[PDB]
């Protein structure tokens, strides 16, 4: 199939659909739109559950509301025949911004001990020395609009934990907001300054030895040589230290997405970490420390012993899957 002509043609077809957004990262092409078949959600007028994925072999449209799933060619044949004509004919035809300052953000180590966010991060049991890698704000939409304007229409004051991300050079290129309130648009709001920014927290703090890669930036604070991808593309390539990285995810043996990521990592021949002999039962290392009384150096003891690679990692995954 021809992917780029599908991306070009799909865009115009889905451009007519309302709530049209171009979810284009550095390696994928997706289009978000309201589904034209069902009108998406009747109760929520602002939901766009129709999606187009063009990074595969064939660009396919999938609706998460009415379970419509089709190729772009069938979509064009059924709904846009004038666009379908040229589509098959063209088919036959070919067949950086740096965060220099953080306004209204105060670092946690220079804050007073009676601050309510200090009580929360003490309840999260972060060690004190990591407190100079964390900021706090009350004007998070104002801060984001100071960095990337236009994403927040109204700058209502929201207290959020600032999580600046530095490169190997140590320059801040993105920042993540942890939601202090239980009610929020998102638990982790990642904001980039330029679209090719690194999404791996704390790359500047990597020393010699094995590099442990986790899922949470707060989880990496207990870990020596601990960095954390903030979702995004989850690209192993964009992740450095490929010869010596350690792939640590959250402890969830019955969760299908976690074992899907484990299978993707172990089929790539990577060094994946396994919780199959863990004395603790919590989902993440921070939850293990907070709820099961675990101290960090026991955890530094367990993982190093159970580091796995390749075929022996496969059996570990076979028994950890269920």
């Amino acid at each position: 199939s021809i992917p780029w002509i599908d991306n070009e043609f799909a865009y115009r077809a889905l451009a007519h659909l309302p709530k049209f957004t171009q979810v284009n990262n550095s390696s994928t092409f997706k289009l978000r739109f309201r589904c034209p078949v069902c009108g998406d959600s009747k109760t929520d007028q602002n939901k766009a559950r129709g999606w187009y994925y063009g990074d595969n072999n064939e660009g396919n449209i999938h609706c998460y509301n009415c379970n419509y799933h089709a190729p772009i060619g069938i979509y064009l044949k059924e709904f846009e025949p004038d666009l379908y004509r040229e589509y098959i004919f063209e088919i036959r035809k070919e067949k950086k911004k740096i965060i220099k300052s953080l306004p209204s953000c105060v670092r946690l180590d220079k804050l007073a001990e009676d601050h309510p966010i200090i009580k929360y991060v003490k309840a999260r049991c972060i060690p004190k020395d990591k407190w100079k890698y964390l900021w706090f704000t009350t004007e998070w939409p104002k801060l984001v609009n100071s960095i990337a304007p236009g994403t927040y229409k109204k700058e209502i004051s929201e207290p959020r934990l600032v999580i600046p991300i530095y490169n190997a050079n140590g320059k801040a290129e993105s920042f993540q907001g942890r939601a202090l309130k239980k009610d929020a648009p998102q638990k982790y709001i990642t904001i980039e300054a330029y679209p090719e920014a690194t999404k791996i927290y704390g790359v500047e703090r990597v020393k010699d030895g094995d590099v442990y890669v986790l899922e949470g930036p707060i989880d990496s604070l207990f870990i020596e040589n601990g960095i954390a991808i903030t979702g995004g593309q989850l690209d192993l390539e964009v992740v450095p230290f490929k010869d010596r990285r350690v792939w640590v995810l959250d402890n969830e043996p019955r969760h299908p997405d976690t074992i899907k990521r484990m299978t993707k990592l172990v089929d790539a021949g990577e060094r994946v970490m396994f919780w199959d002999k863990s004395p603790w039962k919590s989902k993440d290392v921070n939850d293990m420390i907070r709820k099961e009384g675990a101290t960090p150096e026991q955890i530094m003891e367990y993982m190093k012993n159970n580091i796995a690679q390749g075929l022996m990692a496969k059996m570990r995954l076979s028994k950890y899957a269920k």
Binding site: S1, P3, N56, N57, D267, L311, K314, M315, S318, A321, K322
Partner: protein, 432 residues
Amino acid sequence: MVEIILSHLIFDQAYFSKVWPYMDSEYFESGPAKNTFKLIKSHVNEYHSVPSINALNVALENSSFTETEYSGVKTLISKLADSPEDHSWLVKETEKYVQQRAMFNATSKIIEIQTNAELPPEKRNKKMPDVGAIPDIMRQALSISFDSYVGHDWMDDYEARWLSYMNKARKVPFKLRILNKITKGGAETGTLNVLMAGVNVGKSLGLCSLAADYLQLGHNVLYISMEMAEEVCAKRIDANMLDVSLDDIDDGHISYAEYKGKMEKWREKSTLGRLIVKQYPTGGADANTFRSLLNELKLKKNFVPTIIIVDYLGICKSCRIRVYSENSYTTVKAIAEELRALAVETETVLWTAAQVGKQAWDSSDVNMSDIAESAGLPATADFMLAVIETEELAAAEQQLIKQIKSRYGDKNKWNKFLMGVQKGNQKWVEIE
């Protein structure tokens, strides 16, 4: 060393002719190397020649590939270059790489097998081999060397053939000299031997007698009975070997002391094999069931039989056939073919039984055209025998055997030999 392998496949005729027939797509990776080898294999299949760089990157690479796959294949093809290396080191390194990759694939396959079998039924991914056939996969992966062994050359392999002749490493001799003088040394390993007697004429007295003789000859015997329980077959074997009448064991004329004494006297002999009797419901056992039974015996009891005796071929079921057929010709022929395939796979002499036609009942002679279930069964059998004791041989405790089909020798040489049946002891004795 995928790059070197591909480069010397493209740019070396001797290396190609040496290593190509042993190449497989499951050896390189799940990325650019596999796609490049797929292109090369498609070109070689289509044109019977090694492709060039132009054929790879123009005539073949313009195919249904992903952007990432296209870029990887382009980089790998551009990276291919001829390098001067000795054509004894290249072949050995390629052989080592192939062996390592075969072992890796086998390990992954057995891991997947264990993971699948751990799951509960209705999600067990049928057609995937059971946990029992893990060691055979590893053994196959071990023997993945680059040696040319396709068939038996007549002139190039006469030494091994003469070794087989002088050792006679196919014959399993009988305990009866009459059955050895017509088979020229007994039955052969990968063979299907059949008895045809009728109704209540024999056909299990003979099989039990053969099992007893093989047991006395030190062979491991597996008696798979479809029509009789394990206890009754073992009682017939006890009557044969303990020289006690079958009625005496029922009325109670034999004491426990002498029974145990005879059993222990047989035990102390080093020239005694192991006989294992297994019963299956009539019509509920196929060749796959027999293979599962063999694997279970080998794993648990460390029992590898040399003789397999199926009490009745016509009351089994076909593993290949999925829908039962009212046509007895095809079903019985398929059953016999599957049984003979099992025999030649396990190198075990397979004896079975067949039913004769009603016309042959009370007939002084039984021809091969008296076979009842199927005419394809005599075609697949290596040796058939017919029991024709009608009325007078019964009064003289005799049975006449005709030798209807003989693949071990000429069946017209000693067609009849008038075997000495004994139904009380359930055995055959000669008339020497």
